[PDB]
Amino acid sequence: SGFRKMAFPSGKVEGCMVQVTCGTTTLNGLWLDDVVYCPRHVICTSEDMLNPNYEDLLIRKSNHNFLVQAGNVQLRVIGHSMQNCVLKLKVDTANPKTPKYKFVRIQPGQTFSVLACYNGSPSGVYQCAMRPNFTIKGSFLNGSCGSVGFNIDYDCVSFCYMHHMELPTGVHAGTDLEGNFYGPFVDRQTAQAAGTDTTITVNVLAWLYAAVINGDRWFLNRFTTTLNDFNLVAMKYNYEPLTQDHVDILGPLSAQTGIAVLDMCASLKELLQNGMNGRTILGSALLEDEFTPFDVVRQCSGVTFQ
Amino acid sequence: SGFRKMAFPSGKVEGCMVQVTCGTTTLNGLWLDDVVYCPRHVICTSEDMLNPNYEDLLIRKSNHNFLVQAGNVQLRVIGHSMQNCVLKLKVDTANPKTPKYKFVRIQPGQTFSVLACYNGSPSGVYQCAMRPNFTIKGSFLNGSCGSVGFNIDYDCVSFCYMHHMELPTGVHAGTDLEGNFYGPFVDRQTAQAAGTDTTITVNVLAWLYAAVINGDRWFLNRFTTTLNDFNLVAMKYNYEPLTQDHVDILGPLSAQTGIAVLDMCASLKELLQNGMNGRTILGSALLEDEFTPFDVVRQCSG
Ligand SMILES: Cn1cnc(Cn2c(=O)nc(Nc3cc4cn(C)nc4cc3Cl)n(Cc3cc(F)c(F)cc3F)c2=O)n1
Ligand SMILES: Cn1cnc(Cn2c(=O)nc(Nc3cc4cn(C)nc4cc3Cl)n(Cc3cc(F)c(F)cc3F)c2=O)n1
């Protein structure tokens, strides 16, 4: 029993984090096979930045400029190239700690563990959620660029994120491992912010199902709504429209809890209106939207990810 | 910027987890050097649940009774001893993944990470705090015995918790790696219950300093309070008393933010008499108490 925000065991990823240095610029890199991936903003000087020309800035370089630091062993770079906003440094040695891995791109509302590293040395791990505004509410000090977000499926590490920058609002923005930025952003210093965020409704309903599994059953009413009626109330309170796909995903939790979706959307409708009346659900004084429905199965029913 | 709950990279502990099986009992084991640490409850059966004589049951097992499984590799147990509530198993191979480790015993209010493991297979990692009542509000299922709590300090793993049992309230009780239980609990099925939990005050004040560092500033006042007038109010709200030590440990946060500790104690005193009038601190609508002044300084700026 008990419920916590849980991340995947970051062991497999820690062996791939390396330090990449270009000029005075230093950040973290992901070393898989004989290639090191890092933000392409590493070849940037404050003299460029602002309005860059990465393709241009790129070619005019060398292979001894990039100091790929793996621990205190150095790596000979033998070729660079771009791929959207991610730079790939080809090095002479395959990473012997390379896991089963694939690059994936996540939809908003999906969750992933973040291994925040500073100067190639992993420092902390936590569990994030892709916000609807395509930002993540991370905790990143300076020099966090190159920190990677991932998930683990059996023994396959699914790299879905790479850190790039903090917005002035305080949230963070990055790309997938193929350079495609998450959201309406570019990798430079301009005044940038994204759309006003919204609650991931499907994750809140999965969090309520976890509270019922943990005996926290006070919010359960006796009523039932429709997807049409719920989404109309959901729009008012900056909640994401719940769709039919979202419903089917909550199927297992419904049958294992004995409740029902829409019946749960009845409780959430009331909670979105009355508030919680000074009570707490799983000890939280808000509504949590950082647990996907599969996250709740992994933490209450559960499988191990070695 | 941004303030998250942050556990340590569980990489070094994953390489130490094994699966210990004694008869039909299968919990997780901590493989360090040529010794495998695990809760001594693994040597129990159905009849031995309420009042086990573990010394009787231990001089009651042979080395061939223990099955240790690091991945596909079965390990050969060549000795079984007991120190308090943890069973120690000599194996003929040392774990080549063994880190720089040391066994420490934390005090209530100290935080640590937890690697939840099932059948020697790590499944997840999260951040706990040792509650003042010596339990932890962890997340654990059946098969999670042997899961360890830890902190990491310059690639040196400090093992400070080993999960043994879940209490009726749903909180969890375990031992240090020397087998000494945290709290008035014993590894038996005797109906047990922990004292009434309280909020770690010094952790809340540390979290409030972390909010002001992050520019957050919806909750400060012009007031100050005496340490005894603060403790008098905090105790009325199931809060821990604040010692002169706790005031000194909050020293460097009071320095880096220019807000004296007793000034912040007044800002907390006001917070408890009103609530939050809707507003949130660092995204929380409740007061956080699982960030030590160490973690707060760790995660925050300079
Ligand atoms: C507080 N915070 C939250 N997230 C971040 C991530 N982040 C970062 O780590 N570094 C950045 N600029 C650099 C300065 C360097 C100085 N040296 C010696 N080396 C440096 C390397 C970097 Cl990468 N930035 C700023 C930033 C980085 C970008 F890649 C980008 F496209 C726009 C930006 F404004 C940063 O946000 N820090
Ligand atoms: C739901 N939950 C959350 N945390 C825990 C911790 N925990 C555990 O993992 N296992 C326990 N009993 C066992 C039964 C077994 C059945 N087989 C085949 N093998 C078994 C092994 C164990 Cl270890 N317990 C109960 C428990 C374990 C103790 F070590 C103890 F001293 C008293 C207890 F009541 C448990 O709490 N479960």
Cα B21 to middle of ligand 2, angstroms: 13
**Alpha-carbon span B289 to B298, nearest angstrom:** 16
Q: For residue A132, give both structure tokens.
A: 């609807």
Is the sign of the CA dihedral A96, A99, A100, A104 positive or negative? negative
B10, B15, B138 ranked by CB distance to A4: nearest:
B138
Q: Which residues does a 6 A CB cutoff place in the pocket of ligand 1?
A: A 24-27, 39, 41, 140-145, 163-166, 172, 187-189; B 1
The count of other CB atoms within 10 Å of the CB of residue B22 is 24
Contacts B166 to A, Cβ<8 Å: 1-2
B18: closest CA among B124, B106, B145, B131? B145
Alpha-carbon Rg for chain B in angstroms: 22
CB A129 within 8 A of CB A203: yes
Residues A290 and A129 sit within 8 Å (Cβ to Cβ): yes
B125 three-state secondary structure:
strand
Report the side by side order of strands in the sheet with A68-70.
Answer: A73-75, A68-70, A17-22, A25-32, A35-39, A86-91, A77-83
Which residues, 6 or more positions from B90, have their beta carbon under 8 angstroms from its beta carbon?
B34, B35, B77, B78, B79, B80, B81
Contact B38, B146 (CB under 8 A): yes
Place of tokens 């209106």: A273
Q: Could you tell me which of B120, B124, B117, B108 has the C-alpha nearest to residue B144?
A: B117
**H helix or E strand, kind and range, residue A91:** strand A86-91
Q: Whose CA is closest to B4, among A119, A91, A104, A113?
A: A113
CB A36 within 8 A of CB A177: no
A168 touching B (Cβ < 8 Å): no
Answer whether B2 sits within 8 Å of A170, measured CB to CB. Answer: yes
B69 touches chain A (CB under 8 A): no
Answer whether A126's CB lies under 8 Å from B7's CB: yes
Q: At what angle do helices A201-213 and A263-274 cross, to 10 degrees?
A: 100
Give the angle subtended at the CA of B159 by the CAs of B155 and B164, to the nearest 5°: 150
Rounded distance between C-alpha atoms, residue A277 and residue A181, angstroms: 41
Q: What gap in Å lies between CA B58 and CA B38, rounded to an integer?
A: 14
Contact B9, A14 (CB under 8 A): yes
Residue closest via CA to ligand 1's atom 15 equals A25
Query: In chain A, which residues are last before a break of more than 2.5 Å from C to the next N?
Result: none
What CA dihedral angle connects B281, B286, B289 and B295, to 10 degrees? -30
Q: Which of A169, A176, A160 is nearest to A194 (CA)?
A: A169
Question: What is the full DSSP assignment across B239-299?
Answer: BPP--HHHHHHTHHHHHHHT--HHHHHHHHHHHHHH--TT--BTTBSS---S--HHHHHHH
> Alpha carbon of A71 to those of A17, A116, A266, B22: distances in Å?
9, 16, 54, 40
List the single best residue of A3, A8, A10 to mutate versus B (max B Cβ within 10 A): A10
CA distances from A158 to A150, A203, A249, B184, B226 (A): 5, 21, 21, 43, 53
Whether the CB-CB separation of A199 and A109 falls below 8 Å is answered with: no
Q: Ligand 2, closest atom to CA A2?
A: 3
Give me ligand 2 centre to Cα A155, in Å. 27
Whole-angstrom distance, CA of residue B176 vs CA of residue B60 = 25
User: Longest C-alpha distance within chain B, in Å?
Assistant: 69
Atom 37 (ligand 1): residue with closest C-alpha? Answer: A142
Name every residue whose Cβ is closer than 8 Å to that of residue A57 and which is 6 or more positions away in sequence.
A43, A44, A48
Resolution in A: 2.3
User: Which residues of chain B are within 8 Å of residue A215 when distances are taken between CB atoms?
Assistant: 170
All residues at 6 or more sequence positions from A281 whose CB lies less than 8 Å from its CB, including other chains? A207, A208, A211, A216, A218, A219, A287
The answer to whether B122 contacts A3, with C-beta atoms less than 8 Å apart, is: no
Q: Do A5 and B5 touch (CB under 8 A)?
A: yes
Quick check: B140 and A1 CB within 8 A? Answer: yes
A284 contacts in B (CB within 8 Å)? 285-286
Question: What DSSP designation does A302 have?
Answer: I
- Round to whole Å and give the CA distance between A173 and A130: 10
- From residue A45, alpha-carbon distances to A60, B101, B201 in Å are 13, 41, 45
Beta carbons of A274 and A235 less than 8 angstroms apart: no
The CA distance from A88 to the nearest CA of chain B, in Å, is 25
- Which H/E stretch holds residue A77? strand A77-83
Residues B171, A2: C-beta atoms closer than 8 Å:
yes
What one-character DSSP code corresponds to residue B81?
Answer: E
Instruction: Please provide residue A233's backbone torsions phi and psi, each rounded to the nearest 5 degrees.
Output: -70, -30
Residue numbers of B between 247 and 286 with CB closer than 8 Å to A: 280, 283-286
Spatial distance between the Cα atoms of A99 and A113, rounded to a whole number of angstroms: 16
Sequence-separated (6 or more) residues with CB below 8 Å from residue A94: A33, A34
Q: Which two tokens stand for residue A128?
A: 């994030």
What sign results for the dihedral spanned by CA atoms B135, B137, B138, B139?
Answer: positive
Calculate how far, in angstroms, residue B204's C-alpha sits from the geometric centre of ligand 1.
31
Closest residue to A125, CB basis, from B116, B125, B284: B125
Report which secondary-structure segment, H or E, holds B14: helix B11-14
Strand B156-166 to strand B100-103: parallel, antiparallel, or no bridges (unpaired)?
Answer: parallel
Question: Can you say whether the dihedral through the CA atoms of A283, A289, A295, A296 is positive or negative?
Answer: positive
Q: How far is CA B82 from each of CA A57, A196, A256, B69, B126, rounded to the nearest angstrom?
A: 64, 58, 41, 20, 29
Q: What tokens does A178 get?
A: 């193929």
Query: Is the CB of A294 inside 8 Å of chain B's CB atoms?
Result: no
- CA-wise closest residue to A12 among A154, A131, A141, A126: A154
Provide the token pair at A231: 């989404």
The two structure tokens encoding residue B70: 């690091």
**Distance of CA A18 from the midpoint of ligand 1 (Å):** 17
**The two three-digit tokens of residue B16, written as one number:** 């130490």
End-to-end CA distance of chain A: 20
Alpha helices in A216-292 (DSSP H): 227-236, 244-249, 251-257, 263-274
Cα A82 from Cα B278, distance rounded (Å): 47
